[PDB]
């Protein structure tokens, strides 16, 4: 699901954005490109410190959107690229998906996104 | 209302994320930190090339969320910071707000976000 160009983006610094559906509208939170931990089976894991509203939204609708990119990776027509990722989210407080990000001692949980599509949008 | 730290973030490159309300969950698109043009009266202007789905969503619900940040600007507790912006969106195709981003020759419109709140979230 995730292409080589996406892993090239992860070699670079940047702000990741994660959109969820709440009752009254969307919500949008962040992590860092360098915090994402990618596992076998199309999983992207995010260390969770806050994300309380995000977690409440995921209870309502597990489908999330994620974007990220880097000016330092070539897109189709010039320097810079990024991705729109769609997948389903789950929060883990133990087990190997949590252990994947447990080095971040501030993390109360792991946000595990199982990717269904990844589109290079530039 | 946009604070000095937000302008410091804009001096550095990054991926901006813009969330809208779709008919079956959120939608999420991007621009670059360096593409934003900030005008008086709390207006952030984004050059629009694509964003057809985003635009359709805004026509139904003008409320948007925007995030952006930079590893290179100090947050409250370490290097790196970013912002959650909440505001209302409009798409302009003539006049001063369109002219503000018209140097981008690929632009079909200007996405004008009138900021209601800005939160430094790190
Ligand atoms: C650049 C950036 C990186 C962030 N990294 C994380 C992170 O890795 N984990 C996290 O829980 N919150 C992180 N935050 C804060 C979240 O975006 C969010 O504000 C916080 O978790 C509260 O989430 P909620 O609004 O869903 O309750 C980061 C914020 C910024 C601006
Ligand atoms: C880092 C990055 C920057 C982008 N900059 C713009 C931009 O300035 N204007 C634009 O219309 N689309 C830009 N795009 C593409 C949009 O994110 C989006 O994929 C495209 O406009 C289609 O929008 P829609 O899904 O609302 O139809 C950028 C994409 C990335 C990854
Ligand atoms: Cl990073």
Curated annotation (Swiss-Prot), chains A, B:
List cofactor names only. FMN
Transport as UniProt keyword:
yes
User: What is one term from the GO cellular component aspect held by the record?
Assistant: cytoplasm
Is Cytoplasm tagged as a keyword?
yes
Print the keywords alphabetically: Cytoplasm, Electron transport, Flavoprotein, FMN, Transport
Where, per UniProt, does this protein localize?
Cytoplasm
Cysteine disulfide partners in this protein: none
> What quaternary arrangement does the UniProt entry report?
Monomer and homodimer.
**In UniProt terms, what function does this protein have?**
Functions as a redox protein with a potential of -325 mV.
What protein name does the entry list? FMN-binding protein
Native source organism of the sequence: Nitratidesulfovibrio vulgaris (strain DSM 19637 / Miyazaki F) (Desulfovibrio vulgaris)
């Amino acid at each position: 699901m995730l292409p080589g160009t996406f892993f090239e983006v992860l070699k670079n610094q940047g702000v990741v954005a994660i959109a969820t559906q709440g009752e009254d509208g969307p919500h949008l939170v962040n992590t860092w490109n360098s915090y994402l931990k990618v596992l076998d089976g199309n999983r992207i894991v995010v260390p969770v410190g806050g994300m309380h509203k995000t977690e409440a939204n995921v209870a309502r609708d597990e489908r999330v959107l994620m974007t990220l990119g880097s000016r330092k990776v070539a897109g189709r027509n010039g320097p810079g690229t990024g991705f729109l990722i769609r997948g389903s989210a789950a929060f883990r407080t133990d087990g190997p998906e949590f252990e994947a990000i447990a080095r971040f001692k501030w993390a109360r949980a792991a946000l595990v996104i199982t990717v269904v599509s990844a589109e290079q949008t530039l």
